[PDB]
């Protein structure tokens, strides 16, 4: 005889093509113990467990144990996966977390955007470039801004790389004849650094 069901707090899970992700949901019951956590699409039934895409994974530690879902020490569900590079972008998936208390109460699924962040969350897939924000590097002084030579293009690409070590090693850095930088990430998405922040002349 428990009357309330476990409550969930999740978040805004933005994931990126080519990159791994890892988010956590916090679960608390009035009983202080939660015995089961399921993450699923709205389709199904009560015991449905279908979740798509298949690359979305979840895990929970310390299930079914007194006080593992208290306000002082919330139950935490790890939501993680690896987005493949061939995933469409424009794309988001609305999902549900269901938790179970010892008396059997299950989190109620409510199909409404007003629940996003709680037991309902959105997993938004974005392009790789949306994960990084390349930093303005060393200014590279060149002879002429309208005609960067090959070596000046290579020097600007090496300086951008030196300022941005977080950026995927496989990302390609190219510089044009007027000095604009193009960062092509592994999923072929693109970031571009203006020529006036990385290149200068004395004319």
Ligand X SMILES: CC(=O)N[C@@H]1[C@@H](O[C@@H]2O[C@@H](C)[C@@H](O)[C@@H](O)[C@@H]2O)[C@H](O[C@@H]2O[C@H](CO)[C@H](O)[C@H](O)[C@H]2O)[C@@H](COS(=O)(=O)O)O[C@H]1O
Ligand Y SMILES: CC(=O)N[C@H]1[C@H]([C@H](O)[C@H](O)CO)O[C@@](O)(C(=O)O)C[C@@H]1O
Point out which residues bind ligand Y (CB under 6 A): 41, 52, 91-94
178 binds, among ligand Y, Na ion, ligand X, none (CB under 5 to 8 A by kind): none
Q: Beta-carbon neighbour count of residue 154 at 10 Å?
A: 14
191 scored as a contact of Na ion (CB under 5 A): yes
16 scored as a contact of Na ion (CB under 5 A): no
Distance CA 38, CA 8 (A): 11
Distance CA 111, CA 121 (A): 11
Residues 6+ apart with CB under 8 A from 183: 129, 132, 134, 160, 167, 171, 172, 173, 190, 191, 192, 193
Site residues (CB under 5 A) for Na ion, limited to 101-140: 129, 132
129 binds, among ligand X, ligand Y, Na ion, none (CB under 5 to 8 A by kind): Na ion
Nearer CB in complex with ligand X: 94/190: 94
Binding site for Na ion (CB under 5 A): 41, 43, 129, 132, 191
Binding site for ligand X (CB under 6 A): 42-43, 94, 111
């Amino acid at each position: 005889n428990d009357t309330e069901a476990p409550q969930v707090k999740s978040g805004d899970y933005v994931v990126y093509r080519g990159e791994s992700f890892e988010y956590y949901a916090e679960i608390t019951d009035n009983s202080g113990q939660v015995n089961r956590v399921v993450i699923r699409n709205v389709e199904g039934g009560a015991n449905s467990t279908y979740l798509s895409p298949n690359w979305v994974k979840y895990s929970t530690e310390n299930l079914g144990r007194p006080g593992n879902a208290t306000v002082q020490n919330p139950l935490r569900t790890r939501i993680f996966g690896e987005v493949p590079l061939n995933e469409i972008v424009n794309s988001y998936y609305t999902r549900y977390i269901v938790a179970w208390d010892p008396s059997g109460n299950a989190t109620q699924m409510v199909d409404n955007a007003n629940r996003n962040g709680l037991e309902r969350f959105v997993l938004t897939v974005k392009s790789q470039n949306e994960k990084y924000d390349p930093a303005e590097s060393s200014v590279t002084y060149v002879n002429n801004l309208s005609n960067l030579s090959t070596s000046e293009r290579e020097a600007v690409a090496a300086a951008v790389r030196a300022a941005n070590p977080n950026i995927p090693p496989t990302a390609k850095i190219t510089v044009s004849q007027n000095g604009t930088v193009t960062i092509t990430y592994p999923d072929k998405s693109t970031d571009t650094i203006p020529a006036n922040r990385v290149v200068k002349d004395l004319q």
